[PDB]
């Protein structure tokens, strides 16, 4: 009955936050790995390397936050009902 939809939001919602964290978690890694090396090669670059870095992270973090929002929309709104 209605419970079968409830878990359908808890499972699906969980998925929305699984692929979210694998997305940001690795993204912020593979982006930050290019910052450290950069700063490791010339310390005076830390001033300007934040201009590309905080762009990529921005994009990456968007992919997370949207999913975050959707997870709420799955757990606190249950659209298909």
């Amino acid at each position: 009955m209605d419970p079968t939809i409830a878990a359908g939001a808890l499972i699906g919602g969980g998925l929305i936050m699984a692929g979210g964290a694998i997305g940001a978690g690795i993204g912020d890694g593979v982006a930050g790995n290019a910052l450290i090396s950069g700063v490791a090669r010339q310390p005076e670059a830390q001033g300007r390397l934040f201009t590309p870095f905080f762009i990529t992270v921005g994009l990456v973090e968007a992919a997370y936050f949207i999913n975050l929002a959707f997870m709420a929309l799955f757990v606190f709104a249950t659209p298909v009902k």
Binding site: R41, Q42, P43, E44
Partner: protein, 51 residues
């Protein structure tokens, strides 16, 4: 050639990139260094002979 470790000079220095790598470049540059030394020797000898 004698290897003498003179100083540090640069500590937080912007590191050099080597293409393809440092060792191959070094072993390809050493004979050029020897021959430019021999060239400078020949030039100094010519000037000395004229003097």
């Amino acid at each position: 050639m004698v290897v003498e470790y003179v100083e540090e000079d640069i500590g937080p220095r912007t590191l050099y990139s080597f293409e393809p790598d440092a060792t191959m470049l070094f072993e390809s540059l050493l004979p050029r260094y020897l021959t430019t030394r021999v060239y400078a020797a020949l030039l100094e000898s010519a000037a000395s002979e004229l003097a």
